């Protein structure tokens, strides 16, 4: 539930298993990189 | 037709920043502002290439991100702004053919036209039409959007006076600029000019008319017993000249007026395209999104450059001779101010450190010391501080663009007026 | 084989953009298209030289291993067609090899005034074996491209026609797009498919030849039967409207347009043998990485163009300030008697600012003379610093990101699709946890 | 004031660390530290000139906005201490202002051969009362630094020594550290705390004075009572115990903040000799605000990996230096004049220095500085050498060092944001957040 | 010792690329290796000078603090072999110290025409102890390289031998890769071992021949399978050549052999010893990660470099057809330098100088302001800069950094998986506490 896949789109920091929701540069899409 | 944009702005705002606890109140405020929005509508060579890119840019701008004496002027205000933008683009395009020469038409600003002698009269007519359309836009704004903002201000004042009773009991004039300004409208007999409730004074004189003297509230709010509401007039002037959009339109009008003194003043009107399209506005606002951190980083860079400058001033003084001629030298570090200017101006923009310009330390004392000096300067400035400054703005712009996508996703994912997701709705 | 690649593209599209509501419908449509290709496949069944050579061989190897693509007359004509269509991918590979060989040969070109005006002749390392090799390779590549055009027309074009007829008929009998409503403007297909109604050969590829009867029976009560009969045209063997519609639909196809562009460039390669450099770009369309890199630029095209426009207006606002206030430092010449003032007209100053200043990387003040012991020193310093910090730090980085991030997002989407298919059943949303 | 900052620091420490089992113990420790802070607070309670001026004023304003906040002798002695300790942050603000003014005045220095060897003198368009202004400002800066050291001795030193005695007593009682084992290797604090036991005033500021009695009673059977008493130690000049005083000075010196303030003071005294050592005082603004402190700490966050990457770059350049020294040596003629040429790689040391200092900073590789191989042999070899060098340094190694520092800065910001968000969606006692209410 | 390193490595791969389905089988294989490792262990058991010196000392200290760790004649020889077997990581660290020492010595190399042809002379700051010392540490480096390769052969070769025995025996008695099918250079190479009189020299199942023969004794006859499976007197030539070949196949053995070869070649030319400083990358994990980041996305990097070469070739042909008169680099009018008079020369100029320029190819080429084709050349230069420097170089750099960061994140994820979940039981650490 709270945990999210690796490259699946996230919304904010943490709130996934990766815990690090960084964005690539100017990209809007954020994922648990 | 026009209230749709206000609706989009409202919903985007509430999803982006509006909390869940005040969503109903924000909907109520939006609906109250929206009912009378319908009543307002009911009452209403290099030349060829330069031309090619100019036409392409105009096409891209147009495609994405574009009682009757005020009737036709009110519905066409949005098109009037596009017409003004077209005139600004045209005059900017004609401004690219300027030249300077000493011969008669003291440097002079004249025109170089390929047998097109109708260019200067065209520019004059375009400037006149541009100032005329700016005047028309500033005339239409006070009748199109000013009533909405003054009605919102009256709404918030009425809510404060009724539910909170700030003016009679709290009386916070000194604390805020608005509190001082709103004191004048209370005594005016024409307070509910735009507000639907014309009897907002008969409610608060019995809501708080027992603990506090009624004779004080009656005089405070103008309760008594051609038509010149002076205090309401100055209040209206204050709110309209304090408005951000009104201030921007007034700045545009004054720039258009100043453009008659010199046509080059019209170049400032090219910034209207930035506000027209969302992404250019995002680019502009990314700098100010992290303004405090950006200014602090710039200050840290400045003090680091100052430390490097004083270190050079004490020791590496003879290495700052820019002039190649031995008879006449150009000493850039003979003064702390000049050395600091050279370090901030040339060293930061060098891209490889301050040492690319100043003399080679080979074959002289302080050789390895200066090698370390320039290595540290390069690493600490260009590798670190400039990269961090660029990255802060890049991340701010990326997150600002991401915010709109997230707003759309929450729009299409969960029920806004129910709070439940679409998984159950299906 | 072909079905495997088709299913890969279909699943990639469904996972990326296909919604879950219509996922089963997309599967049904793909199965409908896949079965039609089965019978299509059934009917076709029965020193600088050494370094340059080494580098070209390595590049060819890596690009090849990365995934690079009258009774007697009648029986002979079809046999050649199936033979050609069986090895269309090998024909693409041969065309790529021919293009690479010609481009490598083109590197051994020297230009000089004297014959072997300017004369472009070939100079080899005492090997005259390349002069006729180029000509033979040119005609071989032209013939290969011709056969490739014919094979693509015979193999994949019928699938496109079948699909187009499929959606056309489906809309006709399930939505009334033509009789109950009108597609209107802004849709070229809406007006283009109007020419096929009266053609008796409408279900040439589709298996349902009674679609007209069903749509006549369905709308025969709401609308007059004569109207349906006139609209659908129900009453040597050469027709015009169907052929024109077929020509329009093939010219609309992107792959056929690309192959025709290749063919016309092959023809243009005979006017001058040095025109064949355009054929070297087929490597990008073969390997997925370069295709994704190319699509990265187009992914954010509107944002890219509008950011470049913002850069242009910023450079214009800077150029006007440079023109009016400080233009005496714009002398790029070293001779006092011969000036090279780059800011004397608005057009030339704008050109100098955009073409030189942007590419400088350290600001416009690098080329402009330093205002050390003259007036406006602080103004010029602020001007240069702000120009650099805007143009080369913020805006240029934004333009670069609008492509680098786009490429990265495309890669992340591909990996996400791969992981989603690897860890989730396609038919049912059950994850790998319960299904294990 | 102080208590709010201490609370914020506590939350940052606990949430950043991630510890959950020890959360309650940390809360109780903060509670007792807070009671100590309240008790001590109650005890102490009652032209280029114009542009440069504008820029300095703007910088000072922005730094202020964020990052700034004999019987009769007995009463006077404590009144001075109370008044000085009351406004420690005001003293720090005054020190920052004094340093900023001193640096602004120092920004107008000149050198010349003739008197007003090389002599340093001050010039100003009129404004003849700026050099005396600096003369007074140096004295005020030294005085304010002395006040700052006194205020830090009064504010936090008792807190630090009380905390140290607290963990010492806790380890002695709960763990029995000293009577059952020895710190042995490492444990600098544990080894330094040895002299405390013999001092009679172990709980000088700790509340309970019976800690030694508790230790002796608890661990008096397995271990000898006489040994425990000997280990535990069982005219104000004579009554003062030396060992406790040495412990106090050791703990005070070991503290990082006191070391920083002492360095500030010693730089203040050293400034009077050269008048240019006050530039080091501008680094105080970095520690004043969270942003610059995080920026500075991001460099040392990945120090080991940064050193690894720097060493890899150095050894990579060393191989390129060797290759250039053995093969490509005629291309390193920097001097344009043929009569007097110079070879960068005539010796290995100067060749390595040229490759490291110039090649890395070039941004386009080492090939830009050296002579191009246009009409000479080894042209392909030189081209490959330059291309590989430029790639391997600029695209990979320099990008990776910059990458590490920038990523550290980003994470240090992401962790702060995550801590702030977690404190909004957590109760800090029960694992529920805004979902429950 | 080595068992801890083996355990950590096994965990690293078994969590990085090992699924839960075969995790138990991989663990069983690791415990099979571990017993052999314990048997092996039981068997072996009973001025610029000062700055450069400071920098070298600091670098060596930080590197060392983070990585790099006649019957009587026969009785003496076996003890000597055991002595080398016991200490191998220490010899590998001594060799690394010696390489750094001799490289620091080589840093003081000078060349001059006159004797102390172009001769090379050593500069000594009135210390004659250095020139003989160079030869001394060269000899010790060669000796320790020989000791290291002997130790690796003694203590690590049986591990790979017994692992390959596991693999081939398990393939034989489960799948029958050589009787029911046919293979894959390893299969062709190990095939000679099958007919050997003593196949399982290093494995427990010394009677596996009968098991394999009886397992498929009905599909194939006894004689059909018997032929397939079959000092000086005990010289098993096929088995010994198979052992030599699998030893050669080992990557670490190849690394040790390359080290020995470089050490031996360093006597012929003293500057060949500089290749021994690459061992620091293997010593510390992060340098190995940085090195492997380049090859992590090798195929995509090669494709991107090929695209860059193709686009540079396109710009070269565009310039060659039209913009060639502006490529006069030589300032002298009498002697011009035509860089685009030949296609190969112009392509080399574009590839070598255009990419490294940083501001596009237009910086080197002459300004077209005072000539025709000005707008065309301006567009050419701007498009070249934007397409090459802004796009392709940034893509390559971003790919490298992404691969590096992905490797770091994989290591971190492996660590968190170890600390957050039990290896055998799928339950997490929350259940335990
Ligand atoms: N209370 C709501 N009213 C309308 N739409 C809502 C509401 N809550 C969420 N939505 C979402 O907003 C979207 C509807 O779009 P909207 O109401 O803005 O229409 P529109 O953009 O003006 O119309 P159109 O798409 O037809 O041009 C859907 O994704 C829907 O799920
Ligand atoms: N309903 C499904 N039907 C088929 N495959 C499915 C389904 N759900 C998930 N998959 C996954 O799709 C893949 C099936 O594709 P296929 O057998 O062609 O091989 P692949 O995994 O794509 O790899 P490769 O073709 O390189 O061997 C498997 O990874 C399988 O786990
Ligand atoms: N158990 C808790 N104890 C303290 N704060 C809690 C707790 N649970 C949730 N919070 C929340 O954590 C935050 C801590 O509040 P605190 O008083 O430290 O804020 P502050 O940073 O001083 O700001 P402000 O004065 O503007 O609220 C608040 O938002 C509070 O609602
Ligand atoms: N079955 C298991 N047995 C042991 N440790 C396990 C097991 N499953 C998971 N682990 C994890 O492996 C780690 C074992 O300790 P770790 O490798 O971190 O180093 P250590 O405790 O310092 O000692 P050592 O490296 O000597 O084992 C712990 O994080 C533990 O949670
Ligand atoms: C008359 N009137 C309004 O005109 C009105 C309103 N709420 C909003 N509006 C606009 N209410 C409650 C109302 O009574
Ligand atoms: C002949 N035929 C098909 O070939 C066919 C089909 N549905 C799908 N296909 C492919 N139907 C209904 C059909 O009658
Ligand atoms: C000695 N030994 C083992 O150590 C062993 C084994 N099977 C598994 N192992 C681990 N066999 C058969 C065996 O003889």
Residue whose structure tokens are 């942007």: C358
CA distance C302 to chain E (A): 17
Query: What value, to the nearest 5°, has the Cα angle with vertex B54 and ends B50 and B58?
Result: 175
Sequence-distant (6+) residues with CB within 8 A of D130 are: D105, D108, D122, D124
Q: Is the dihedral of CA C394, C399, C400, C401 positive or negative?
A: positive
Q: How many Cβ atoms from other residues are within 10 Å of residue D322's Cβ?
A: 25
3-state SS, C357-389, equals HHHHCCCCCCCCCCCCCCCCHHHHHHHHHHHHH
Q: Which of E91, E275, E283 is CA-nearest to residue D308?
A: E283
CB of B372 less than 8 A from some CB of D: no
**Which one-letter DSSP state was computed for residue B355?**
G
Report residue C187: phi and psi, to 5°: -140, 105
Residue of D nearest to A14 (CA): D418
Q: How far, in Å, CA of B10 to CA of B6, rounded? A: 6
Which two tokens mark C108? 């051994």
Q: How far, in Å, CA of C14 to CA of C33, rounded? A: 15
Q: Do the beta carbons of residue E410 and residue E16 sit within 8 Å?
A: yes
CA distances from E414 to A5, B255, E227, E383 (A): 16, 62, 48, 45
CA distance A8 to chain D (A): 19
Residue of D nearest to A23 (CA): D410
Q: How far, in Å, CA of B401 to CA of C401, rounded? A: 13
Kindly state the helix (H) or strand (E) to which residue E112 belongs, with its residue range. Answer: strand E109-112
Residue whose structure tokens are 């001050």: D122
Q: With contacts defined as CB-CB under 8 Å, which chain A residues touch D418?
A: 13-14
Tally of CA atoms within 13 A in the half-sphere of E12 that contains its CB: 13
The full set of domain ranges for chain C reads 2-144, 158-254, 299-422
Q: Is the dihedral of CA C343, C345, C346, C351 positive or negative?
A: negative
CA distances from E188 to D136, E182, E220 (A): 91, 9, 21
- The length of chain A is 33
Ligand 7 centroid distance, CA of E35 (Å): 9
Question: How many helical (H) and strand (E) elements, i.e. helices and strands, does chain B have?
Answer: 21, 2
In a 10 Å sphere around its CB, with 0-12 CB exposed, 13-18 middle and 19+ buried, how is residue C135 labelled? exposed
Q: How many Cβ atoms from other residues are within 10 Å of residue E49's Cβ?
A: 11
Q: Which of E159, E322, E342, E171 is CA-nearest to residue E253?
A: E159
Q: How far, in Å, CA of B91 to CA of B97, rounded? A: 11
Residues E280, D352: C-beta atoms closer than 8 Å: no
Interface with chain D: mutation pick from B298, B310, B372, highest number of D CBs within 10 Å: B310
Tally of CA atoms within 13 A in the half-sphere of C365 that contains its CB: 26
CA distance D48 to chain C (A): 7
Report residue C253 CA to chain centroid gap: 12
Q: Whose alpha carbon is nearest atom 3 of ligand 2?
A: C426
Sequence-distant (6+) residues with CB within 8 A of E323 are: E340, E365, E373, E376, E377, E380
Sequence-distant (6+) residues with CB within 8 A of D250 are: D192
**Which one-letter DSSP state was computed for residue E275?**
G
Q: How far, in Å, CA of C136 to CA of C105, rounded? A: 12
Q: Which of B250, B246, B242 is CA-nearest to residue B180?
A: B242
Question: Measured between CB atoms, which of C47, C51, C378 is closest to D51?
Answer: C378
E204 is in an annotated binding site: yes
Q: How far, in Å, CA of B92 to CA of B263, rounded? A: 9
Which ligand 4 atom is at minimum distance from the Cα of E423? 8
Residues B391, D405: C-beta atoms closer than 8 Å: no
C376: left (phi over 0), alpha (psi -120 to 50) or beta: left
Q: What is the dihedral of CA E287, E288, E290, E294, to 10 degrees?
A: 150
Report residue E234 CA to chain centroid gap: 37
Residues D414, A14: C-beta atoms closer than 8 Å: no
Query: What value, to the nearest 5°, has the Cα angle with vertex C214 and ends C212 and C220?
Result: 95
Report residue E344: phi and psi, to 5°: -65, -45
CB of B62 less than 8 A from some CB of A: no
E423 is in an annotated binding site: yes
Residues B353, D361: C-beta atoms closer than 8 Å: yes
Q: With contacts defined as CB-CB under 8 Å, which chain D residues touch A13?
A: 414, 417-418, 421
Pairing of strands D119-122, E119-122: unpaired
Kindly state the helix (H) or strand (E) to which residue C121 belongs, with its residue range. Answer: strand C119-122
Q: What is the DSSP string of D186-241?
A: S-HHHHHGGGGTTSS-TTSSSS-S-HHHHHHHHTSSSS-HHHHHHHHT--HHHHS-
Give ligand 1 pocket residues (Cβ under 6 A).
B 411-412, 415-417
Question: How many helical (H) and strand (E) elements, i.e. helices and strands, does chain E have?
Answer: 20, 2
Residue whose structure tokens are 């307002």: B40
CA distance C413 to chain A (A): 8
Q: How far, in Å, CA of E266 to CA of E274, rounded? A: 9
Q: How far, in Å, CA of E329 to CA of C158, rounded? A: 57
Q: Which of D312, B265, D54 is CA-nearest to residue E404?
A: D312
Question: How many helical (H) and strand (E) elements, i.e. helices and strands, does chain C have?
Answer: 20, 2
Distance spanning both ends of chain A, measured CA to CA: 18
Query: What value, to the nearest 5°, has the Cα angle with vertex C34 and ends C32 and C38?
Result: 120
Which two tokens mark E164? 């390959």
Report residue D109: phi and psi, to 5°: -100, 160
Q: How far, in Å, CA of B413 to CA of B410, rounded? A: 5
3-state secondary structure of E213: helix
Report residue C399 CA to chain centroid gap: 22
Report residue D262: phi and psi, to 5°: -65, -40
Report residue E335: phi and psi, to 5°: -115, 100
Tally of CA atoms within 13 A in the half-sphere of C3 that contains its CB: 12
Q: Which of C382, B295, B384 is CA-nearest to residue D285?
A: B295
Q: How far, in Å, CA of D131 to CA of D122, rounded? A: 7
Sequence-distant (6+) residues with CB within 8 A of D79 are: none
Q: Do the beta carbons of residue D382 and residue D329 sit within 8 Å?
A: no
D154-182 burial by CB neighbour count: b if 16+ within 10 A, else e? bbbbbbebbbbbbebbeebeeeebbbeee
Kindly state the helix (H) or strand (E) to which residue E211 belongs, with its residue range. Answer: helix E208-215
Q: What is the DSSP string of C255-311?
A: HHHHHHHHHHHHHHHHH-GGGGGGGGGHHHHHSHHHHHHHHHHHHTHHHHHHHHHHH
Q: Which of B368, B348, B347, B369 is CA-nearest to residue B357?
A: B347
Kindly state the helix (H) or strand (E) to which residue D122 belongs, with its residue range. Answer: strand D119-122
Which two tokens mark B56? 């392409």
Q: Do the beta carbons of residue B69 and residue B44 sit within 8 Å?
A: no
Report residue D52 CA to chain centroid gap: 29
Report residue D122: phi and psi, to 5°: -105, 140
Q: How far, in Å, CA of D14 to CA of D11, rounded? A: 5
Q: Which of C340, C354, C343, C306 is CA-nearest to residue C321?
A: C343
Sequence-distant (6+) residues with CB within 8 A of E126 are: none
**Which one-letter DSSP state was computed for residue C187?**
-
Q: With contacts defined as CB-CB under 8 Å, which chain C residues touch E354?
A: none
Ligand 3 centroid distance, CA of D424 (Å): 7
- The length of chain B is 426
Q: Do the beta carbons of residue D136 and residue D101 sit within 8 Å?
A: no
Ligand 3 centroid distance, CA of D113 (Å): 64
D126: left (phi over 0), alpha (psi -120 to 50) or beta: left
Pairing of strands D109-112, E119-122: unpaired
Q: How far, in Å, CA of C266 to CA of C279, rounded? A: 8
Q: How far, in Å, CA of E73 to CA of D10, rounded? A: 71
Helix axes D303-326, E285-296, angle to 10 degrees: 70
The full set of domain ranges for chain A reads 1-33
Q: Do the beta carbons of residue E93 and residue E64 sit within 8 Å?
A: yes
Q: Do the beta carbons of residue B282 and residue B178 sit within 8 Å?
A: no
CA distances from D237 to D76, D244, D247 (A): 22, 13, 17
Computed on alpha carbons and rounded to an integer, the radius of gyration of chain D in Å comes to: 31
Report residue C49: phi and psi, to 5°: -65, -50
Which two tokens mark C126? 């005492």
Q: How many Cβ atoms from other residues are within 10 Å of residue B24's Cβ?
A: 10
Q: Whose alpha carbon is nearest atom 8 of ligand 3?
A: D427
Q: How far, in Å, CA of E155 to CA of E91, rounded? A: 14
Residue of B nearest to A9 (CA): B406
Chains within contact range of chain C (3+ C-beta pairs < 8 Å): A, B, D, E
Annotated resolution, angstroms: 3.1
Sequence-distant (6+) residues with CB within 8 A of D199 are: D233, D241, D243, D244, D247
Report residue E109: phi and psi, to 5°: -90, 135
Beta bridge partners of E119: E112
Residues A27, B404: C-beta atoms closer than 8 Å: no
Report residue B144 CA to chain centroid gap: 21
CA distance B203 to chain D (A): 35
Q: Do the beta carbons of residue B147 and residue B40 sit within 8 Å?
A: yes
Q: Which long-range contacts (CB under 8 A, 24 or more apart) does D144-149 make?
A: D144/D91, D144/D94, D144/D95, D144/D98, D145/D95, D145/D261, D145/D264, D145/D265, D145/D268, D146/D265, D147/D84, D147/D91, D148/D88, D148/D91, D148/D92, D148/D95, D148/D261, D148/D264, D148/D265, D149/D261, D149/D262, D149/D265
In a 10 Å sphere around its CB, with 0-12 CB exposed, 13-18 middle and 19+ buried, how is residue C180 labelled? exposed
Q: Do the beta carbons of residue D208 and residue D255 sit within 8 Å?
A: no
Q: Which long-range contacts (CB under 8 A, 24 or more apart) does E333-337 make?
A: E337/D374
Which ligand 7 atom is at minimum distance from the Cα of E32? 10
Q: With contacts defined as CB-CB under 8 Å, which chain A residues touch B406?
A: 11
3-state secondary structure of E342: strand
**Which one-letter DSSP state was computed for residue B101?**
E
Q: Which of C412, C17, C303 is CA-nearest to residue A10?
A: C412
Q: Do the beta carbons of residue E324 and residue E366 sit within 8 Å?
A: no
Q: How many Cβ atoms from other residues are within 10 Å of residue B71's Cβ?
A: 11
**Which one-letter DSSP state was computed for residue E328?**
B
Beta bridge partners of E428: E421
Ligand 4 centroid distance, CA of E419 (Å): 7
Which two tokens mark B220? 């405070």
Q: Which long-range contacts (CB under 8 A, 24 or more apart) does A10-14 make?
A: A11/B406, A12/D421, A13/D414, A13/D417, A13/D418, A13/D421, A14/D418, A14/D421, A14/D422
Q: How far, in Å, CA of D23 to CA of D40, rounded? A: 26
Beta bridge partners of B109: B100
Sequence-distant (6+) residues with CB within 8 A of C358 are: C311, C315, C391, C392, C396, E382
CB of C408 less than 8 A from some CB of A: yes
Residues 287-346 of C with CB under 8 A from B: 302-303, 305-307, 309-310, 312-313, 316-317, 320, 323-324, 327, 344-346
Which two tokens mark C351? 């050109």
Kindly state the helix (H) or strand (E) to which residue D144 belongs, with its residue range. Answer: helix D131-155
CB of D277 less than 8 A from some CB of E: no
3-state secondary structure of B421: strand
* Probe target for ligand 2 pocket from C422, C423, C428, with the most ligand atoms within 8 Å of CB: C422
Residue of D nearest to C48 (CA): D380
Q: How far, in Å, CA of C232 to CA of C214, rounded? A: 12
Beta bridge partners of B414: B421
């Amino acid at each position: 539930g709270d945990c999210l896949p690796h490259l699946k789109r996230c919304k904010a920091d943490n709130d996934c298993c990766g815990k690090k929701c960084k964005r690539r540069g100017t990209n809007a899409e954020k994922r648990c990189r | 037709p026009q209230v749709k944009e206000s609706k989009r702005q409202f919903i985007f705002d509430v999803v982006n920043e509006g909390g869940e606890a005040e969503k109903m109140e924000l909907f109520v405020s939006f609906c109250e502002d929206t009912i009378f929005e319908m009543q307002i509508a009911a009452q209403i060579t290099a030349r060829e290439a330069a031309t090619a890119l100019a036409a392409l840019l105009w096409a891209v701008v147009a495609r994405a991100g574009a009682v009757k004496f005020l009737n036709y002027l009110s519905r066409n205000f949005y098109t009037l702004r596009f017409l003004a933008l077209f005139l600004a683009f045209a005059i900017n395009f004609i401004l690219l053919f300027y030249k300077v020469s000493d011969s008669p038409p003291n440097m002079v600003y004249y025109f170089l036209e390929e047998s097109t002698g109708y260019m200067e009269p065209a520019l004059w007519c375009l400037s006149l039409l541009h100032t005329l359309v700016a005047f028309l836009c500033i005339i239409g704004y006070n009748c199109l959007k000013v009533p909405l903002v003054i009605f919102k201000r009256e709404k918030e004042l009425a809510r404060k006076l009724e539910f909170d009773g700030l003016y009679i009991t709290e009386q916070p004039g000194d604390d805020d600029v608005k509190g001082q300004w709103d004191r004048l409208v209370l005594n005016t007999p024409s307070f509910p000019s735009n507000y639907w409730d014309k009897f907002v004074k008969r409610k608060v004189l019995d809501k708080h008319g027992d603990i506090f003297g009624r004779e004080r509230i009656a005089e405070l709010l103008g309760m008594d017993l051609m038509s010149i509401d002076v205090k309401y007039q100055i209040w209206k002037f204050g709110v309209i000249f304090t408005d951000n959009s009104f201030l921007y339109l007034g700045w545009y009008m004054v720039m258009s007026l100043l453009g008659h003194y010199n046509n080059f003043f019209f170049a400032a009107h090219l910034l209207d395209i930035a506000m027209g399209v969302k992404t250019l506005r995002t680019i502009l606002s990314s700098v100010t999104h992290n303004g405090k951190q950006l200014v602090m980083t710039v200050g840290l860079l400045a003090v680091v450059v100052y430390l490097y400058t004083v270190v050079a001033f004490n020791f590496f003084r003879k290495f700052y001779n820019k002039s190649e001629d031995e008879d006449e030298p150009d000493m850039k570090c003979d003064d702390m101010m000049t050395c600091y200017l050279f370090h901030m101006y040339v060293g930061v923009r060098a891209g490889g450190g301050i040492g690319d310009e100043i003399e080679d330390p080979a074959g002289d004392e302080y050789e390895l010391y200066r090698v370390v000096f320039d290595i540290t300067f390069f690493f600490f400035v260009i590798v670190i501080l400039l990269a961090i400054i660029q990255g802060l703005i890049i991340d701010a712009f990326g997150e600002l663009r991401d915010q709109q996508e997230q707003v759309k996703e929450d729009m299409e994912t969960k029920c806004f007026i129910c709070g439940i997701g679409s998984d159950y709705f299906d």
